[PDB]
Amino acid sequence: MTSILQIALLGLVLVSFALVVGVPVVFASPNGWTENKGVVFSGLSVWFLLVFAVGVFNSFA
Template sequence: MNFLFQFAVFTFIGFSFLLLIGVPVVFASPGGWTEAKLKTPLFSGLGVWFLLVFFIGIFNSFVV
């Protein structure tokens, strides 16, 4: 159970790092936010990030 929790935290850190780089790249693209082709992967990443936040918060109560 600890391994699953550690894997979830590691995945959360990885997605946070990708979003830390990805969001400024999308906003700095030539068309800006309105013509960005990376909206779909960015929104998917944000969705996974929020799911990981809730999963880690719930799963944290089971890991002692």
Template sequence: MNLLFQLAVFAFIGFSFLLLISVPVVFAYPGGWTETKLKTPLFSGLGLWFLLVLIIGILNSFVV
């Protein structure tokens, strides 16, 4: 269970870094937020980020 928790935290950190880079890039596109076609991947990424937060919260209750 410890290994699964550590892998989830590592994925969370890596994905957070990916979003840290990609969100400003999406907003910097010409035409801004309204005309970009990157909304769907960005919202999917945010959903996955929240899912990782929930998974880490659940796994945290099993780690001693």
């Protein structure tokens, strides 16, 4: 059950890397925030679910 924790954590790192690249360029693009709301919220929701998943799966690891 450790392998699922490393997969969840590395997925969290990839999500955070994409967020560091994407959230500023989505914010500062012309009229890009108005059309990328859904993808940014999707990234943040997956990020939060993976943080909670890693935290919970550490209690079983």
